[PDB]
Symmetry: C5
Subunit: 259 residues, 5 copies
Amino acid sequence: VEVLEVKTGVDSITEVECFLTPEMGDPDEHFRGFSKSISISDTFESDSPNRDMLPCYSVARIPLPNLNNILMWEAVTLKTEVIGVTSLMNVHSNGQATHDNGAGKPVQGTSFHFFSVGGEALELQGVLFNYRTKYPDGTIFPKNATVQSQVMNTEHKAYLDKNKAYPVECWVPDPTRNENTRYFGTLTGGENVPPVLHITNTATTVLLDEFGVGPLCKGDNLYLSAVDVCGMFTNRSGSQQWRGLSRYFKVQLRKRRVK
Amino acid sequence: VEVLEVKTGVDSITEVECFLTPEMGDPDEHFRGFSKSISISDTFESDSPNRDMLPCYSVARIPLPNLNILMWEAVTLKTEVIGVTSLMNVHSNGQATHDNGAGKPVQGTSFHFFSVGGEALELQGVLFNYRTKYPDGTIFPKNATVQSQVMNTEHKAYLDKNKAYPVECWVPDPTRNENTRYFGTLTGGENVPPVLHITNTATTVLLDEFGVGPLCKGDNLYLSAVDVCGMFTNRSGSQQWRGLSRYFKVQLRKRRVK
Amino acid sequence: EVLEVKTGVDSITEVECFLTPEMGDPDEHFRGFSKSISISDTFESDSPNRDMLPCYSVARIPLPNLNILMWEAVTLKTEVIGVTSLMNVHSNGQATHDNGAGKPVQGTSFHFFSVGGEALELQGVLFNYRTKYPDGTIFPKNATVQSQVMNTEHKAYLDKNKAYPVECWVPDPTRNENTRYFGTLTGGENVPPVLHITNTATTVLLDEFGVGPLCKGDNLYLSAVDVCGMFTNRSGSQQWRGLSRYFKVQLRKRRVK
Amino acid sequence: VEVLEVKTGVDSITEVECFLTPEMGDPDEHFRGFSKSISISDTFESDSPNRDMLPCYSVARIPLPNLILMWEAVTLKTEVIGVTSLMNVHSNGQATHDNGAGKPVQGTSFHFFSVGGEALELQGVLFNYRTKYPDGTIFPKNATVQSQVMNTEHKAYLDKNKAYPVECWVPDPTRNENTRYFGTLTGGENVPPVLHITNTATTVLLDEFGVGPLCKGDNLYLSAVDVCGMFTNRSGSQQWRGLSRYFKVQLRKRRVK
Amino acid sequence: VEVLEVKTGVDSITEVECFLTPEMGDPDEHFRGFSKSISISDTFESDSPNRDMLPCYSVARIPLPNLILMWEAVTLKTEVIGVTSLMNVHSNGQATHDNGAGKPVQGTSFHFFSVGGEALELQGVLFNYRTKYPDGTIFPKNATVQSQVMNTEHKAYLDKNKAYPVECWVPDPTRNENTRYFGTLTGGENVPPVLHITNTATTVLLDEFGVGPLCKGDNLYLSAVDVCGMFTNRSGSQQWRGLSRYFKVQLRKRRVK
């Protein structure tokens, strides 16, 4: 694809606005946004997490107005934020008291906040904490794992092309690919790390590369992907569940001619 | 409305200055700025917080000079938390940090938030637990379902009343608020330290990317805030939210519109 | 009405000084420290002694007499003096663990400074409106429950040393048009002091119109608080510890009408 | 060398893209990316770490297209690969508390990378000069008590994998004119990993004269360490855990005399 | 001095490169880089630290090429040497918990460096004015309770090694016109070392008038402190641990009258 001029005129711009809901495991009918309580295997080789205990990447494929000269929608800017940050102030709902007579412990600990915008599915590379982990039916996970999968095994390539499927802990954006995607993520690990969640409607991320070209939407589809694992909630027994929140996306696109 | 030129001349600018007081729950006649002590439900299903245990959003609607088309446009903001040093009172019925030590200071989960707009802040509801029974006297997401724990688009509201909209149920709606600028930070965790900066030298510009600030419908400016600074721990170990007031200074100019 | 700056040889001057901390100074050996902190039994009975309450520091500095011209404060260099003294972990401290070094100064801090052409203006806010503030301090009078959040009756000028308790008063953001102030409260029992020193950092005091504080009566007002945290002695008792603050201010002559 | 002009044209640029795997010790066939559990010596004189307990620097020598012209390294994109793997808190980890999840990888980390036109030059510094380093490693020789602060005899080249222990060696600041290096040690038992990923960030490798590393013999040297912290198993024993690092380097042809 | 033009020509610039070793106390022949174990007095009045328990400021006077012209210091590159040595958590440390690795160096740190055309000027500030400083050290004399906040009698030059204890001296902000200094005290028993290394970072030493330190008698003065934290041994006892600092300074010839 040789990239040519941007179209102008009223017809030449469009906006996508939506929310991606978290997929933390959803153990039952009352626990949307939460994982199952975390259990710990007694050996590496017996690590067999249930599906409902594994957060997954979220993805939405958004159809854009049909275009076909070959024109493609080009993603130019992003506004994004985590929705519902203040819900983490509920420290009165079956939580483990911080001390005698104290309030409930807030959600805290290991977090992963991630978003991407691309003109095609996010491309993934698998990396495993423990190559002998047995991933459950209904998830899509690195196959033919070997001990090298604990550091780098280039066989583990995938596309984030399905919801509730790709577990967060197995997969990262592939930096050898993703030419047509812009991705951003932070892992903050550690049992006691505080969530620090900023909101504002005044911040924009520009999606143009160094040559002034943003993601180009193949087949007139925009791909949005997210993970917002905020930490763990600790119930009165001490059991811990991951808690996630939804992410808002607003993307501005323009028409671009290509050869 | 088409946005045309800014009016100039001495008559063409005005300033609003005020303080919004915090609404932390105010459990009795002596506890302004504090919530009731926090209690924990025995199960998720039985979460039923009392009103006086729930911090709410603060809002003030400020009448501007009558323009009876011109609209007042909010251009700049200075803001800070007022009374930050009060949190140095570590001698007032606090739980000692250790034997013979001073009282524990206010610390833990905080939410610091402010907005300036030409109409009421628009809110979206998100619930930690959709089975929480919110108390009479509050305005809370209705017809809550399990989807309310992540996103239920039925939960829309306007921040149009004080002591009413609990902080934990509501956030600014990012799908709306075109005529408001909002900023907030949640810092979660029971041992988080307050970090509170004050200065009269810092200004926030409210203009969007097109150079246009919030336009004040009906000559009213809307200021909203939350400043939950953390929790105070009493000698018994019981904990209450503590909030502080927020100062706002907004400069406005007259803008012609069609 | 602010007009042009005067230029020429004698059109500039500088002020340099240090402000010592006023942490309560419980006896002849404890300058820079408060008394050990005691905790009241109830809210209603909170009654801190004077020597347990850090206060704001202030110095009024006379400038070369211009007797209209006024001295205009343009730049500030400032820093906390004696930061390395906090490495004394061997002087009657509480050991951090068995056989360990003494606990360093840490926990709640307030670092504040201002430069103005008149006294810093203060607004009172009380943690607990029923606190009985001690004789010898200047504190919010006629306190009500509203004083816990905002009572606009509580206005004062920082016009006296060893007098205005830090915990009762803050700069009044509705006033202070002729002062530039800066402060950070870092709360929490275990926060680490982070104290930077350098002679290479300058703060410009000019407002958005290019005008700095104008010194009424040819006096410059400098104010400070540097409560660095608490020192924990062997017994567990805790005292606030403060340090002095250096100020260097450059001023120029400005004509006004 | 006198550095002259950059060549232009489609033929004048090339790219290198690769990953460097971590070398943490790899104690057996199941533990690639981990060290052996850490044991503590009973005295300074008995410090005798086994080879599989010692993380080492990673290095790749990347041959470039044969070319006086030299390849000049201009830009770098880099990131840690597999950051989300640290969310496995269900695999034989010590619980945070009764009934809790497993502890994540945390504690002391070192994240380091360099790009150069020749091997990274190293200076040896020892925590304890009486440490006996194991066979199969390359370590400072003829160590003396001065090796604990600076012994200029301890000079080496990062010229072999799985060989140079992280704890014994640092980039030599007195050399390395033809390399750009970047590192952060974050020490402490409980420090959290903070790992950022993005494909939108570039580091420029040019010095203040506009010249990047020049690749002698048409070789590019990439080096890394990414000790992320320690994993604690159910027994309490701790192992270093490392992750791979991605490098993408753009190079241009430069004439030199 | 009136400062006139900079000389040009290849002969007009010179470079100084060196390292300053830390002086942490060096309690015996195996503990270079460490202090003596830290002990704690029973009272403020009985604080009497051993010489070998007191870290001191490091200084080097560097003769420059003989030169009215003066060498002007223009830029500095600096970094702490040996940061990875703190990854030795296997040498007689105290285990973080049962079966765990040794605690890393952590706790109170002071990182400081200065470049000047004359000795660094010091001001004394004492945590406890009754501290008895040991023979062999140069300390604030005639101390009074005011010495705990500011006593202007305590002036000195950093003109000798292994002499000026860190805890009782700071740079004098009222002087040091011909020096640039930078430092950070990070206090608290659990603070994590955060130590960055790179050969790509330069500090410019020029003041607001474009004038760097001017080297009187063709001598450049470099000063440093890098107390990284404390090492905790098996018994729980703690020693300060320091590291060396690299300096590279570029200078140019400046004419003066």
